[PDB]
mmCIF file of C-alpha atoms and ligand atoms in Angstrom:
data_model
loop_
_atom_site.group_PDB
_atom_site.id
_atom_site.type_symbol
_atom_site.label_atom_id
_atom_site.label_comp_id
_atom_site.label_asym_id
_atom_site.label_seq_id
_atom_site.Cartn_x
_atom_site.Cartn_y
_atom_site.Cartn_z
ATOM 1 C CA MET A 1450 -0.010 -0.026 -0.063
ATOM 2 C CA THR A 1451 1.469 3.456 -1.011
ATOM 3 C CA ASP A 1452 1.199 6.669 0.736
ATOM 4 C CA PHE A 1453 -1.219 7.916 -2.092
ATOM 5 C CA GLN A 1454 -3.492 4.990 -1.538
ATOM 6 C CA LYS A 1455 -3.351 5.372 2.233
ATOM 7 C CA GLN A 1456 -4.104 9.124 2.068
ATOM 8 C CA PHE A 1457 -6.933 8.347 -0.570
ATOM 9 C CA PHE A 1458 -8.744 5.696 1.647
ATOM 10 C CA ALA A 1459 -8.520 8.452 4.534
ATOM 11 C CA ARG A 1460 -9.789 11.252 2.423
ATOM 12 C CA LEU A 1461 -12.849 9.059 1.441
ATOM 13 C CA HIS A 1462 -13.590 7.733 4.832
ATOM 14 C CA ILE A 1463 -13.581 4.126 3.799
ATOM 15 C CA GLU A 1464 -11.681 1.145 4.909
ATOM 16 C CA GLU A 1465 -7.951 0.742 3.880
ATOM 17 C CA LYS A 1466 -7.506 -2.326 1.492
ATOM 18 C CA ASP A 1467 -4.509 -4.177 0.323
ATOM 19 C CA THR A 1468 -6.532 -5.785 -2.445
ATOM 20 C CA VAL A 1469 -8.778 -3.536 -4.299
ATOM 21 C CA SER A 1470 -11.304 -5.215 -6.617
ATOM 22 C CA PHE A 1471 -13.316 -4.152 -9.640
ATOM 23 C CA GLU A 1472 -16.513 -4.535 -7.627
ATOM 24 C CA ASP A 1473 -15.126 -2.186 -5.294
ATOM 25 C CA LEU A 1474 -14.792 0.738 -7.687
ATOM 26 C CA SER A 1475 -18.404 1.724 -7.629
ATOM 27 C CA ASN A 1476 -18.336 2.265 -3.863
ATOM 28 C CA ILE A 1477 -15.069 3.976 -4.003
ATOM 29 C CA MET A 1478 -16.522 6.450 -6.564
ATOM 30 C CA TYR A 1479 -19.613 7.161 -4.425
ATOM 31 C CA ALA A 1480 -17.334 7.835 -1.534
ATOM 32 C CA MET A 1481 -15.237 10.115 -3.656
ATOM 33 C CA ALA A 1482 -18.418 11.955 -4.610
ATOM 34 C CA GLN A 1483 -19.479 12.296 -1.077
ATOM 35 C CA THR A 1484 -16.255 13.724 0.152
ATOM 36 C CA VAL A 1485 -14.243 15.551 -2.691
ATOM 37 C CA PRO A 1486 -16.013 18.507 -4.056
ATOM 38 C CA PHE A 1487 -15.962 19.777 -7.681
ATOM 39 C CA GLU A 1488 -14.489 23.366 -7.232
ATOM 40 C CA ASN A 1489 -12.389 25.940 -9.097
ATOM 41 C CA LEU A 1490 -10.977 28.053 -6.547
ATOM 42 C CA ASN A 1491 -7.152 27.487 -7.280
ATOM 43 C CA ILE A 1492 -7.732 29.182 -10.537
ATOM 44 C CA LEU A 1493 -9.369 32.214 -8.980
ATOM 45 C CA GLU A 1494 -6.615 32.416 -6.156
ATOM 46 C CA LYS A 1495 -4.068 31.903 -8.842
ATOM 47 C CA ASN A 1496 -2.351 29.115 -6.928
ATOM 48 C CA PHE A 1497 -3.048 26.164 -9.161
ATOM 49 C CA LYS A 1498 0.057 23.841 -9.724
ATOM 50 C CA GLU A 1499 1.395 21.513 -12.257
ATOM 51 C CA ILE A 1500 -0.801 18.335 -12.597
ATOM 52 C CA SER A 1501 1.063 15.481 -10.781
ATOM 53 C CA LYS A 1502 0.574 12.826 -8.439
ATOM 54 C CA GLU A 1503 2.413 14.576 -5.702
ATOM 55 C CA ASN A 1504 0.853 17.963 -6.106
ATOM 56 C CA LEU A 1505 -2.568 16.327 -6.177
ATOM 57 C CA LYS A 1506 -1.869 14.201 -3.045
ATOM 58 C CA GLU A 1507 -1.082 17.452 -1.304
ATOM 59 C CA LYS A 1508 -3.979 19.679 -2.681
ATOM 60 C CA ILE A 1509 -6.797 16.912 -2.495
ATOM 61 C CA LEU A 1510 -5.705 14.351 -0.110
ATOM 62 C CA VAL A 1511 -3.473 16.153 2.515
ATOM 63 C CA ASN A 1512 -5.105 19.750 2.306
ATOM 64 C CA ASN A 1513 -8.672 18.385 1.995
ATOM 65 C CA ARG A 1514 -9.530 20.404 -1.394
ATOM 66 C CA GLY A 1515 -11.404 19.474 -4.357
ATOM 67 C CA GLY A 1516 -10.752 20.308 -7.993
ATOM 68 C CA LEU A 1517 -11.977 20.363 -11.546
ATOM 69 C CA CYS A 1518 -12.033 17.214 -14.113
ATOM 70 C CA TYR A 1519 -8.187 17.621 -14.661
ATOM 71 C CA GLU A 1520 -7.457 17.278 -11.167
ATOM 72 C CA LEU A 1521 -10.099 14.724 -9.838
ATOM 73 C CA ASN A 1522 -9.871 12.304 -12.566
ATOM 74 C CA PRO A 1523 -5.887 12.088 -12.493
ATOM 75 C CA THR A 1524 -6.306 11.797 -8.760
ATOM 76 C CA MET A 1525 -8.410 8.753 -9.223
ATOM 77 C CA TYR A 1526 -6.315 7.385 -11.916
ATOM 78 C CA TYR A 1527 -2.961 7.487 -9.604
ATOM 79 C CA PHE A 1528 -5.067 5.875 -6.990
ATOM 80 C CA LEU A 1529 -6.357 3.023 -9.445
ATOM 81 C CA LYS A 1530 -2.723 2.749 -10.866
ATOM 82 C CA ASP A 1531 -1.198 2.082 -7.461
ATOM 83 C CA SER A 1532 -3.960 -0.446 -6.638
ATOM 84 C CA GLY A 1533 -2.761 -2.485 -9.652
ATOM 85 C CA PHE A 1534 -5.476 -1.763 -12.273
ATOM 86 C CA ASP A 1535 -4.579 -1.096 -15.872
ATOM 87 C CA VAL A 1536 -5.691 2.578 -16.342
ATOM 88 C CA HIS A 1537 -5.180 5.451 -18.677
ATOM 89 C CA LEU A 1538 -5.949 9.033 -19.214
ATOM 90 C CA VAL A 1539 -7.940 10.230 -22.167
ATOM 91 C CA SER A 1540 -8.571 13.646 -23.569
ATOM 92 C CA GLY A 1541 -11.999 15.129 -24.590
ATOM 93 C CA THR A 1542 -14.257 18.217 -24.789
ATOM 94 C CA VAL A 1543 -17.451 19.005 -23.080
ATOM 95 C CA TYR A 1544 -20.628 19.724 -24.777
ATOM 96 C CA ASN A 1545 -23.032 22.490 -23.831
ATOM 97 C CA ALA A 1546 -26.211 20.926 -24.512
ATOM 98 C CA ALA A 1547 -28.034 24.091 -23.399
ATOM 99 C CA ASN A 1548 -26.491 26.459 -25.962
ATOM 100 C CA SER A 1549 -26.097 23.737 -28.388
ATOM 101 C CA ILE A 1550 -22.090 24.355 -28.779
ATOM 102 C CA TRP A 1551 -18.953 22.937 -27.557
ATOM 103 C CA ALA A 1552 -17.055 23.990 -24.453
ATOM 104 C CA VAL A 1553 -13.315 25.015 -24.779
ATOM 105 C CA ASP A 1554 -11.554 22.431 -26.993
ATOM 106 C CA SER A 1555 -9.757 19.714 -25.057
ATOM 107 C CA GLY A 1556 -10.964 20.824 -21.701
ATOM 108 C CA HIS A 1557 -11.829 17.501 -20.193
ATOM 109 C CA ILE A 1558 -9.681 14.829 -18.749
ATOM 110 C CA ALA A 1559 -11.013 11.286 -17.793
ATOM 111 C CA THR A 1560 -9.716 7.859 -17.045
ATOM 112 C CA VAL A 1561 -10.280 4.596 -18.701
ATOM 113 C CA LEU A 1562 -9.934 1.237 -16.915
ATOM 114 C CA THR A 1563 -9.321 -2.231 -18.414
ATOM 115 C CA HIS A 1564 -10.877 -5.022 -16.510
ATOM 116 C CA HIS A 1565 -11.284 -8.685 -18.038
ATOM 117 C CA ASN A 1566 -10.431 -7.590 -21.338
ATOM 118 C CA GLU A 1567 -13.255 -4.874 -21.275
ATOM 119 C CA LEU A 1568 -13.084 -1.119 -21.250
ATOM 120 C CA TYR A 1569 -14.775 1.073 -18.639
ATOM 121 C CA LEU A 1570 -14.710 4.869 -18.330
ATOM 122 C CA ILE A 1571 -13.953 5.925 -14.752
ATOM 123 C CA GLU A 1572 -15.597 9.381 -14.358
ATOM 124 C CA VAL A 1573 -15.435 11.217 -11.085
ATOM 125 C CA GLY A 1574 -14.691 14.764 -12.315
ATOM 126 C CA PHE A 1575 -17.597 15.831 -14.521
ATOM 127 C CA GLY A 1576 -19.231 18.456 -12.067
ATOM 128 C CA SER A 1577 -22.105 16.612 -10.314
ATOM 129 C CA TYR A 1578 -22.822 14.646 -13.354
ATOM 130 C CA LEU A 1579 -21.375 11.556 -11.988
ATOM 131 C CA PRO A 1580 -22.127 7.941 -12.851
ATOM 132 C CA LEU A 1581 -20.893 6.847 -9.393
ATOM 133 C CA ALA A 1582 -19.758 3.657 -10.982
ATOM 134 C CA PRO A 1583 -17.707 2.604 -14.055
ATOM 135 C CA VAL A 1584 -19.200 3.141 -17.373
ATOM 136 C CA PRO A 1585 -18.720 -0.030 -19.757
ATOM 137 C CA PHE A 1586 -17.733 0.855 -23.188
ATOM 138 C CA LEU A 1587 -20.042 -2.186 -24.296
ATOM 139 C CA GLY A 1588 -22.912 0.466 -24.194
ATOM 140 C CA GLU A 1589 -24.785 -0.664 -21.095
ATOM 141 C CA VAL A 1590 -26.692 2.039 -19.261
ATOM 142 C CA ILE A 1591 -25.410 2.990 -15.601
ATOM 143 C CA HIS A 1592 -28.201 4.297 -13.487
ATOM 144 C CA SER A 1593 -27.257 6.661 -10.638
ATOM 145 C CA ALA A 1594 -28.871 9.265 -8.604
ATOM 146 C CA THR A 1595 -27.325 12.062 -10.783
ATOM 147 C CA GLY A 1596 -28.853 10.594 -13.864
ATOM 148 C CA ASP A 1597 -28.420 7.972 -16.550
ATOM 149 C CA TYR A 1598 -24.991 7.501 -18.521
ATOM 150 C CA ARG A 1599 -23.996 5.441 -21.455
ATOM 151 C CA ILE A 1600 -20.969 5.264 -23.886
ATOM 152 C CA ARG A 1601 -21.402 5.204 -27.652
ATOM 153 C CA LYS A 1602 -18.664 4.920 -30.128
ATOM 154 C CA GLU A 1603 -19.226 8.103 -32.431
ATOM 155 C CA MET A 1604 -17.014 10.214 -34.520
ATOM 156 C CA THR A 1605 -17.525 13.713 -33.688
ATOM 157 C CA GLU A 1606 -15.143 16.543 -34.333
ATOM 158 C CA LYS A 1607 -13.974 16.369 -30.742
ATOM 159 C CA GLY A 1608 -13.357 12.387 -30.261
ATOM 160 C CA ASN A 1609 -14.199 9.046 -31.380
ATOM 161 C CA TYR A 1610 -16.440 8.129 -28.584
ATOM 162 C CA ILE A 1611 -19.185 10.019 -26.478
ATOM 163 C CA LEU A 1612 -20.573 9.997 -22.975
ATOM 164 C CA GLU A 1613 -24.206 10.500 -23.166
ATOM 165 C CA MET A 1614 -26.753 11.065 -20.260
ATOM 166 C CA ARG A 1615 -29.949 11.813 -18.994
ATOM 167 C CA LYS A 1616 -31.764 13.173 -16.015
ATOM 168 C CA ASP A 1617 -34.930 13.982 -20.262
ATOM 169 C CA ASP A 1618 -33.817 12.349 -23.391
ATOM 170 C CA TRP A 1619 -30.165 11.288 -24.033
ATOM 171 C CA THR A 1620 -27.850 14.281 -24.557
ATOM 172 C CA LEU A 1621 -24.160 14.576 -25.165
ATOM 173 C CA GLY A 1622 -22.035 15.136 -21.974
ATOM 174 C CA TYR A 1623 -18.519 15.273 -23.599
ATOM 175 C CA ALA A 1624 -16.864 13.650 -26.723
ATOM 176 C CA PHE A 1625 -13.223 12.246 -26.214
ATOM 177 C CA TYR A 1626 -10.610 10.179 -27.895
ATOM 178 C CA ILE A 1627 -9.908 6.538 -26.843
ATOM 179 C CA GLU A 1628 -6.182 7.261 -27.546
ATOM 180 C CA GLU A 1629 -4.074 7.632 -24.460
ATOM 181 C CA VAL A 1630 -2.610 10.798 -22.968
ATOM 182 C CA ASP A 1631 -0.330 11.565 -20.125
ATOM 183 C CA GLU A 1632 0.058 14.387 -17.482
ATOM 184 C CA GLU A 1633 1.227 16.724 -20.094
ATOM 185 C CA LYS A 1634 -2.320 16.669 -21.648
ATOM 186 C CA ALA A 1635 -3.624 17.036 -18.209
ATOM 187 C CA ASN A 1636 -1.506 20.326 -17.621
ATOM 188 C CA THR A 1637 -2.641 21.623 -20.890
ATOM 189 C CA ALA A 1638 -6.540 21.031 -20.106
ATOM 190 C CA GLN A 1639 -5.759 23.071 -17.074
ATOM 191 C CA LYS A 1640 -3.925 25.963 -18.891
ATOM 192 C CA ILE A 1641 -6.864 25.902 -21.137
ATOM 193 C CA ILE A 1642 -9.450 26.060 -18.448
ATOM 194 C CA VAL A 1643 -7.417 28.575 -16.580
ATOM 195 C CA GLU A 1644 -6.561 30.964 -19.375
ATOM 196 C CA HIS A 1645 -9.342 30.632 -22.363
ATOM 197 C CA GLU A 1646 -11.608 33.567 -22.174
ATOM 198 C CA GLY A 1647 -14.561 31.189 -22.969
ATOM 199 C CA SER A 1648 -13.777 28.947 -20.142
ATOM 200 C CA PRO A 1649 -16.512 28.458 -17.569
ATOM 201 C CA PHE A 1650 -14.331 28.104 -14.677
ATOM 202 C CA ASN A 1651 -12.046 31.264 -14.477
ATOM 203 C CA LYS A 1652 -14.641 33.897 -13.963
ATOM 204 C CA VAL A 1653 -16.472 33.360 -10.576
ATOM 205 C CA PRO A 1654 -16.308 30.676 -7.881
ATOM 206 C CA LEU A 1655 -18.104 27.443 -8.523
ATOM 207 C CA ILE A 1656 -18.434 24.702 -6.060
ATOM 208 C CA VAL A 1657 -20.501 21.505 -6.307
ATOM 209 C CA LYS A 1658 -20.916 18.246 -4.365
ATOM 210 C CA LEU A 1659 -23.049 15.283 -4.003
ATOM 211 C CA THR A 1660 -24.490 14.696 -0.598
ATOM 212 C CA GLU A 1661 -26.515 11.867 0.958
ATOM 213 C CA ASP A 1662 -29.746 12.943 -0.343
ATOM 214 C CA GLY A 1663 -29.014 15.109 -3.421
ATOM 215 C CA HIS A 1664 -26.238 17.828 -3.905
ATOM 216 C CA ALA A 1665 -25.241 21.133 -2.863
ATOM 217 C CA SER A 1666 -23.888 24.076 -4.934
ATOM 218 C CA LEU A 1667 -22.078 27.294 -4.193
ATOM 219 C CA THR A 1668 -21.208 30.280 -6.007
ATOM 220 C CA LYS A 1669 -20.190 33.964 -5.267
ATOM 221 C CA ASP A 1670 -23.728 34.903 -4.665
ATOM 222 C CA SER A 1671 -25.827 31.867 -3.889
ATOM 223 C CA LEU A 1672 -26.112 28.563 -2.325
ATOM 224 C CA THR A 1673 -28.306 25.854 -3.856
ATOM 225 C CA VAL A 1674 -29.283 22.642 -1.645
ATOM 226 C CA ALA A 1675 -31.131 19.949 -3.311
ATOM 227 C CA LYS A 1676 -32.599 17.075 -1.598
ATOM 228 C CA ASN A 1677 -35.283 14.636 -2.990
ATOM 229 C CA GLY A 1678 -38.404 16.588 -4.164
ATOM 230 C CA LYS A 1679 -37.002 19.713 -2.478
ATOM 231 C CA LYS A 1680 -34.423 22.441 -3.765
ATOM 232 C CA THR A 1681 -33.343 25.643 -1.555
ATOM 233 C CA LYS A 1682 -31.800 28.594 -3.143
ATOM 234 C CA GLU A 1683 -30.378 31.626 -0.957
ATOM 235 C CA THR A 1684 -28.136 34.315 -1.158
ATOM 236 C CA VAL A 1685 -24.748 34.256 0.211
ATOM 237 C CA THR A 1686 -22.602 37.109 1.418
ATOM 238 C CA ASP A 1687 -18.893 37.442 1.637
ATOM 239 C CA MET A 1688 -19.162 36.914 5.381
ATOM 240 C CA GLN A 1689 -20.975 33.631 5.007
ATOM 241 C CA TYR A 1690 -18.827 32.227 2.344
ATOM 242 C CA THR A 1691 -15.998 30.899 4.342
ATOM 243 C CA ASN A 1692 -18.138 29.190 6.857
ATOM 244 C CA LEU A 1693 -20.190 27.530 3.908
ATOM 245 C CA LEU A 1694 -17.127 26.429 2.018
ATOM 246 C CA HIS A 1695 -15.952 24.581 5.299
ATOM 247 C CA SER A 1696 -19.261 23.454 6.688
ATOM 248 C CA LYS A 1697 -20.678 22.214 3.520
ATOM 249 C CA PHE A 1698 -17.717 21.246 1.560
ATOM 250 C CA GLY A 1699 -14.774 20.624 3.822
ATOM 251 C CA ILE A 1700 -12.888 23.531 1.999
ATOM 252 C CA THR A 1701 -10.467 25.853 3.698
ATOM 253 C CA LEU A 1702 -8.424 28.227 1.601
HETATM 254 C C1 KH2 B 150 -24.327 15.460 -32.106
HETATM 255 N N1 KH2 B 150 -23.944 16.656 -31.402
HETATM 256 C C2 KH2 B 150 -24.502 16.973 -30.297
HETATM 257 C C3 KH2 B 150 -25.978 17.079 -30.220
HETATM 258 C C4 KH2 B 150 -26.617 17.436 -28.842
HETATM 259 S S1 KH2 B 150 -27.749 16.573 -27.899
HETATM 260 O O1 KH2 B 150 -28.196 16.962 -26.551
HETATM 261 O O2 KH2 B 150 -28.989 16.299 -28.713
HETATM 262 O O3 KH2 B 150 -27.368 15.080 -27.901
HETATM 263 C C5 KH2 B 150 -24.423 17.915 -32.355
HETATM 264 C C6 KH2 B 150 -23.180 18.542 -33.061
HETATM 265 C C7 KH2 B 150 -22.404 17.579 -33.632
HETATM 266 C C8 KH2 B 150 -21.834 16.985 -32.459
HETATM 267 C C9 KH2 B 150 -22.565 16.911 -31.338
#
């Protein structure tokens, strides 16, 4: 068991395990969603670092922060790698179904896992749109509390595969290429999301995390808490913003 693995189990508040199985992945992903939030604050504080195993262990596992896709998915990638799984990073581009257009090119990073000769997409970083389990490339629908998810082989101008989702009809989440990439592509996604003028993540604070009974979202101005059949939206002032970061998301800057 490496230090990365130990800090990871600790971060997720789940049992240490010297042998991690495939059947375990779903519950680790669920635990990761409950504990590690999607957040962009290091872009705004201008203290993002190079994407690496050490920097990420320190930011996410030691300092109990969250991150964006190019931080959360490589984090899981490293955990999965030390756990003996055959894993790879892939690059893609998110689609903005609302406005019917692509997000910034090559802004997304994700993880693919090989088990028993079959491919699974491991997705823990796509905001709150989380499958909470591996998504089989064979095409099977994964049902989670955040919605439905499936992979399709499909050439677009942003990849040769797609992650589709709902919840009302199937809509494109992101397109990606199955071709393997490394940390340098991850650092490039960061640069893109930090710098590009059309990036959704370099203007205002954005923090989301799943919870027991739904999810919670925070911005410069408002806190949204969704439970089942109930949503609360409320204004947040600068004075309440530090407490909320800590109390709802375990974030201390
Ligand atoms: C296929 N598509 C996405 C459609 C968007 S939908 O929400 O309906 O799934 C349209 C532009 C070409 C590449 C992406």
